[PDB]
């Protein structure tokens with residue numbers, strides 16, 4: 127169910143970054159992101175990617191508009207950049223709230239669950255990380271697309287036959303990342319294998335001061351060593367959906383500046399970046 131575009135319609139603008147190269151473009155009075163081919167050697171790689179980018183259609187997944195000469199791909203241009211850039215990119219960094227953090231994660235679990243539910247075979251993302259999570263609509267709508275050791279389940283680089291529960295591990299790490307606005311395992315550093323060794327040994331990001339026990343529970347379950355003890359994405363979506371009742375305001379665009387500074391990890395427990403005062407407030411009104 128694809129679409130063809132005269133490569134003469136594509137108004138190739140400038141490059142944006144990088145498999146292949148990605149260039150901002152225009153096409154039918156809209157902004158568009160195109161993914162050129164780098165050499166003949168990548169002909170086959172582009173193929174498998176387009177077999178699944180047609181099957182897939184979901185709000186929280188990058189839309190493929192539709193062309194092939196030279197091998198190209200026509201996708202929607204997320205003006206907001208990567209979530210990684212929002213969290214840790216070049217200053218000025220935008221200010222965001224606890225509701226933004228939860229909405230981003232909710233929207234991500236929604237997109238992954240659609241892939242896990244794909245027929246006939248469940249499509250596994252295998253590389254869930256903020257660099258691959260793009261933002262649109264003032265940074266309020268997250269969308270998925272295609273040094274990952276920080277977000278990698280310990281059974282993946284273990285070579286074991288893995289499943290879709292490795293994305294659940296990634297999601298868990300991402301939830302800790304938007305709440306703390308910290309790069310996971312930035313203290314370890316070194317080459318990737320030094321993080322792989324740490325996570326494989328059981329190391330996890332530190333716990334968050336004054337984190338709601340429901341959120342702490344879900345986060346830790348998602349990054350259990352035993353994949354079968356991690357919840358399904360369907361379960362994550364459900365839980366995140368019902369928690370949003372206590373996180374209003376995910377619709378407000380990111381527009382306010384932020385001079386963000388990072389306290390060191392004093393005593394194995396880190397301070398969150400977002401504020402949960404409004405959550406404990408709304409929660410007590412329903413309970414007590």
Ligand SMILES: */C=C/C(=O)Nc1ccccc1Oc1nc(Nc2ccc(N3CCN(C)CC3)cc2)ncc1Cl
Nearest residue numbers: 142143144148159201202203204205207208258271272
């Ligand atoms: C979809 C997976 C993926 O890898 N996306 C992606 C990552 C990095 C670069 C390009 C990519 O592609 C797309 N990019 C966009 N939109 C976009 C806008 C701006 C930026 N910049 C601006 C600032 N610099 C410093 C860094 C990032 C990146 C991306 N939209 C769609 C797609 Cl497919």
